[PDB]
């Protein structure tokens, strides 16, 4: 029996994060991931004030921001703070354990310094998890593993996204779900993010594939839709990420009856 | 029916960047990577300048360089001309095609401004490599592709290796070979870099695995080792590169017969 947002926050085994981010999800009503690859820091501040009420989650794109500073990520913790969503950025973590670790709380980013959630590949076995982990847990943060893609001709099927939900099973201390295109685990404990969703059918010219939130959220039963393009891509950005968040919110309460 | 790195430049299909590897290959006596993940420009720099005559080739991690600049990579790239090798950037490129792009030509790094060879990730499908190609190849780029991964629990085998290598051979004016632990590919004109190599037997506390040059190029085929903490770790990192130079390239020698 489906249990409510509210209720798996509670769960006994919930991660913290995701106790953190499933209690927002249900008070404001969205289930929606906003994903923002724009240029400029000031292009990211305004759409997170902007559109920060209508979000459960911001995937920032930190490898794509021309100026990048830690003061940005500062002020950006305090919106995330105000309006209530996570951070999470969406660098796909895909290398061995010992660099990884590196990647993950170093260099110019920091990541580890600000993102709530972060996301790993699977590929390299376990270590990637455990290199990652190792900055991760004294710092209070949860990882997500992809398990499925949203592009033409993904390998991250069958015995690979079955490797996934193990491997996030044996890492529950810091993993708390996946980047998916459906339901991959029976534990409620782990969320479920799906990126590759539009309203209209379609993809872009580089192999994305879209399908619609009631597609993801309600029959493949999916928890959070991440959007990009068709949010900031539209004329009307508020309206989009309402429309957006109705659409998944709607298809969630329907899953839940 | 094994050609020398000097015969291979030669090859027909040869890609420019290729061709360049291969002629500093030989006439340096070098098939020699340097894996380079240290935290300061002024340690990048003063390594690239002393074993710049040992390699054909460095990798650089840019994400764990915590004072990255681009004078910092002009510099690079004045030591890079000197000695003639090769600009590796590690960054294991690993999401859908419109996001590379962004990933490779912008941000803080500009890694494709820089960056002779980049390496990616074939879980996405084949939409990473385009997102790549259209801005690597007016560039004079190559891209590697990650067929095999020397971790412990690796997911990088089978028919995933399979794809790896059909990929490759469909990218042909841009991809240029394969990260892998053996050779993957029959066809000359792709390279073969194997990363996990080290002269003693051992691994890491996270999931990394070695195996010596004599194995990896005389044995499993291999055309260049990477090398980083066997190197890097050492009290002298000159003579340690020495030391791996000539084995990997008297292993090659070996092999030709
Ligand atoms: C990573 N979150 C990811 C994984 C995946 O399989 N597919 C995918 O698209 N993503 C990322 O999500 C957004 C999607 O943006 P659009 O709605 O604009 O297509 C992008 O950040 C991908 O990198
Ligand atoms: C990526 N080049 C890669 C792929 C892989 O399967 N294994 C692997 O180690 N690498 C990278 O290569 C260096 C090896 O460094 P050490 O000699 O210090 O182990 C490493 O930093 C990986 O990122």
Same sequence: chains 1, 2.
Wanted: hydrophobic residues 45%; contains cysteine.
């Amino acid at each position: 029996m489906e249990l409510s947002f509210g209720a798996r926050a509670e769960l006994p085994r919930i991660h913290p994060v995701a106790s953190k981010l499933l209690r927002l999800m249900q008070k404001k009503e969205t289930n929606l991931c906003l994903s923002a690859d724009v240029s400029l820091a000031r292009e990211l501040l305004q759409l997170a004030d902007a559109l920060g009420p209508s979000i459960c989650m911001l995937k920032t794109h930190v490898d794509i921001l021309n100026d990048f500073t830690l003061d940005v990520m500062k002020e950006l913790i305090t919106l995330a703070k105000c309006h209530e969503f996570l951070i999470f950025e969406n660098r796909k973590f895909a290398d061995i354990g010992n660099t990884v670790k590196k990647q993950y709380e170093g260099g110019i980013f920091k990541i580890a310094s600000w993102a709530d959630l972060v996301n790993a590949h699977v590929v390299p076995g376990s270590g990637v998890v455990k290199g990652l982990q190792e900055v991760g847990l004294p710092l209070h943060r949860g990882c997500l593993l992809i398990a499925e893609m949203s592009s033409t001709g993904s390998l991250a099927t069958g015995d690979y996204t079955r490797a996934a939900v193990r491997m996030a099973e044996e890492h529950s201390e810091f993993v708390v779900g996946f980047i998916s295109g459906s339901r991959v685990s029976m534990k409620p404990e782990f969320l479920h993010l799906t990126p590759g969703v539009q309203l209209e059918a379609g993809g872009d010219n580089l192999g994305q594939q879209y399908n619609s939130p009631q597609e993801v959220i309600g029959k493949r039963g999916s928890d959070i839709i991440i959007v990009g393009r068709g949010i900031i891509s539209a004329a009307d950005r508020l309206e989009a990420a309402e429309m957006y968040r109705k659409a998944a919110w709607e298809a969630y309460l329907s899953r839940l009856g």
